[PDB]
Symmetry: C2
Subunit: 193 residues, 2 copies
């Protein structure tokens, strides 16, 4: 019934620890206590399972966004809390993928672009609350929203190419994170009123 | 003596109008009034000639930077004039390349990284003048410098992948340019004093 969920979770951990390439369907089967024969009923390809895991992770972001958003702090505190959360998401994905996932197939072509659009929308919503709450000036909520989202994406993009799957330290994330704030911080002053 | 320079200029135009792939050594020879046999004395590969053209273009950026920098306007006016110039450079390169040049071989691996470092340095120098001129607070001139440079690079990176060699309009550059200011503008307020 929710064995799927078991298979997904198993998979998540494997990929988190070892990645996609070194990981094996015989392994994931072992983990859930099944047999490839059974696993293939749910997934007929390591890539498909990986996508499930990506999608689970994307949902976790939204769930946490919902928490922040229903926590009733101000427009600014939300925006910042978002940046942190967006940053940590990126971290999860790099830790599962370790490859050329971000730097890009047709499926992921779409999982990206939808997320990036959901994201712009979430942000437009915080801007909107700020506007009404009167913390932010109106403003094209939407233009700004995109800008912030793109600004953050650029931080992430410049930091890769820059580094490599292996050539990546723990200070490499402190960098991402610390930069994404700088940007967040500056964006806020472009609308603080 | 300076036939090289002729060959480079010929090449520049061809590539500007038609690109690298559709362009031909027999064509460039025609242009300068030579023969492949002679052209190959200067260049033994279309790629090599292309690099010369990239390097000529990179030098033109520096030459213009030198003009701006010896024009004695303030730290702010220079910084902005730089962003415009950096933007226009990017424009030149996309117009010569129309391919996966930016999105990346070993040679260009280096032409990029050196430029990006010369660039950080130029910028550190404007920051430094601002500091002494007392327009900008000190400040880690260097951290900031990088940040601005990376910020601009991100605008460029997000705008590609986003589009394609062909799927790129004239409004696509108005976008680049207009975004790179937004960023410039915001950066300035992070140090205006």
């Amino acid at each position: 019934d929710g064995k799927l969920e078991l298979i997904i979770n198993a998979a998540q951990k494997r990929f988190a620890h070892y990645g996609l390439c070194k990981t094996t369907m015989n392994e994931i089967a072992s983990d859930v206590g099944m047999g490839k024969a059974s696993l293939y009923y749910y997934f007929p390809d390591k890539e498909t399972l990986f996508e499930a895991v990506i999608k689970k992770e994307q949902n976790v972001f939204f769930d946490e966004m919902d928490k922040i958003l229903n926590s009733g702090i101000d427009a600014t505190a939300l925006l910042k809390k978002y940046v942190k959360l967006r940053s940590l998401h990126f971290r999860h994905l790099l830790n599962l993928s370790k490859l050329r996932s971000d730097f890009t197939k047709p499926v992921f072509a779409k999982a990206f672009e939808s997320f990036k659009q959901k994201e712009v929308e979430i942000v437009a919503g915080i801007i909107q609350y700020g506007i009404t709450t009167k913390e932010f000036k109106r403003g094209n909520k939407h233009e700004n929203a995109e800008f912030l989202v793109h600004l953050l994406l650029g931080v992430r993009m410049v930091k890769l190419k820059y580094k490599e799957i292996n050539d990546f330290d723990e200070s490499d994330y402190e960098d991402l994170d610390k930069n994404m704030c700088k940007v967040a911080g500056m964006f806020l002053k472009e609308i603080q009123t």
